[PDB]
Every structure is written in structure tokens, then in C-alpha cells.
Amino acid sequence: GIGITEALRLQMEVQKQLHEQLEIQRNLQLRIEEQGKYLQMMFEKQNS
Amino acid sequence: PERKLTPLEHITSLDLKGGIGITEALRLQMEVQKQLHEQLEIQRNLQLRIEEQGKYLQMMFEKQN
Amino acid sequence: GIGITEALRLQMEVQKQLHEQLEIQRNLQLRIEEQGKYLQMMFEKQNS
């Protein structure tokens, strides 16, 4: 079995990977939004 | 995958030559934006739940001491 | 403080929300890929 020391180490790694996923999602969402901006601009070009 | 794509979300060359690829792409964008918001909701939940599990582990590390 | 019973309940909810995020990512990636397919088709139209 695992001890309390490794359990607390796993807990710290979980929280840091969670925050890490959060930061990747922000950067991902920033890029998806710019894809959307491009798509909206293309759509309006074809209606001008 | 789990939910596979409907004809309204599948973009074919037939769609492009009809000029509806752009609007289907904008539909995909709407769905992706909502899913991203849902995943944002869940990690906030996960962060909160993990932190509560963390305080349980901490208080029992100090009952040794 | 929280008890062992709620700690184990939190653990189950964490794993189920994790799997839940995984399923949302698959569906998200499926849709991003189709956006990419559209973009690749548009790019090749402008080079034909």
C-alpha cells in the first residue's frame, strides 16, 4: 500500500495538473475564439 | 467519440459547393464554445472537490503529530 | 472537519467528473476536427 506521505504528494500533483489543465483551456479557448472570428468575417464577406 | 455528428454538423464537399460549409462551421463553433464552457464548469468543481479531499488528508497528517 | 464517508464520496464524484470531462473532450475534438476538414477543403479550393 501507499503511505500518507505519497497520498499527500499525489494530492499536490493533482491540484497542480488541474490548474495546468485550466491554463491550457484558456489558451485553447482564446484560439478557438479567433477561429470563430475568422469564420464570422468570412460569412459576412459572402453577404456583402 | 460518443455523440457522433449529425448531417447538420458533418461538412462534406457537397456542402461546400452549396455554400453552406461556412454556416455548418459556425454551428460547430457554437457547439464547441458551449462544450468548452461546460468543461470550465467541471474543473472548477473538480478543483473544489479535490481541495476538500486535501483538507481531510492534511488534518489526518497532523493527528499523528 | 469532513469524515471518511464524505471523503470517499468526494473521491467517487471526482472520478466521475473526470470521466465526464474525458467524454466531453472526445465530442469536442470530433467537432474541432470537422472544422479543420472544412478549413482544409476551403484552402484547396483556393489552390485549384
Add this chain to the structure above:
Amino acid sequence: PERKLTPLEHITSLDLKGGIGITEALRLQMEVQKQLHEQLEIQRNLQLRIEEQGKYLQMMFEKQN
């Protein structure tokens, strides 16, 4: 956000009238695909780490019994 977008990832109306909006969108696609793969790597890691924390909690629930 954290990493803001470079001019190579920012899509302006100036880019569209130069006909490079499509290639910048394809650049954004490449970056998004890599980030999605990274987030996939991390949840596998998170699932494995959470499960190991789970077996510690289970074995201590049964040391009561």
C-alpha cells in the same frame, strides 16, 4: 488567457483581404489540436493519480472494520 496571440495567430480583416486568413486559421487548428492532445495526456494522468489516492482511502476505510 496566459499566452496571448502572436500576429501569426491573430486574424484581422487586413489578413482576409490578403487571403491569409485561411492559413492562419489552419495554424490555429494545428495549435488547438496539440493542446487537445496535451489535455488528453493530463486527464489520463489525473485519472491514474486520483485512482491511487482512492485505494489509499479504501484501505483505511477497511482498517476500521
